[PDB]
From a paper:
Seven of the nine structures present an antiparallel (AP) backbone of class 7 or 8 topology, while 2 peptides, those of APRGLP2 and polymorph D of APRTc5b, form class 1 or class 4 steric zippers both comprising of parallel (PA) β-sheets. The glucagon-like APRs (APRGLP2 and APRGLP1) show an extensive contact surface (Sc = ~0.80; Area = ~160 Å2) along the extended, linear backbone of high complementarity, while exendin-like sequences (APRex-4 and APRTc5b) present generally smaller values (Sc = ~0.65; Area = ~110 Å2). Aromatic side chains form intrasheet aromatic ladders in the two parallel structures of APRGLP2 and APRTc5b (polymorph D), as well as in both polymorphic structures of APRex-4. Additionally, within a zipper, amide groups of Gln and Asn side chains can stabilize parallel β-sheets by axial H-bond ladders. The amyloid crystal structures of APRGLP1, APRGLP2, and APRex-4 revealed the nature of emerging interactions between charge-abolished side chains contributing to steric zipper stabilization.
Here, we identify an evolutionarily conserved hexapeptide sequence as the major aggregation-prone region (APR) of gastrointestinal peptides of the glucagon family: xFxxWL. We determine nine polymorphic crystal structures of the APR segments of glucagon-like peptides 1 and 2, and exendin and its derivatives. We propose that the pH-dependent changes of the protonation states of glutamate/aspartate residues of APRs initiate switching between the amyloid and the folded, monomeric forms of the hormones. Our results highlight the dual role of short aggregation core motifs in reversible amyloid formation and receptor binding.
Author numbering: 1 to 6
């Protein structure tokens, strides 16, 4: 699982 916040 991951968080990708741009």
């Amino acid at each position: 699982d991951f968080i990708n916040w741009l």
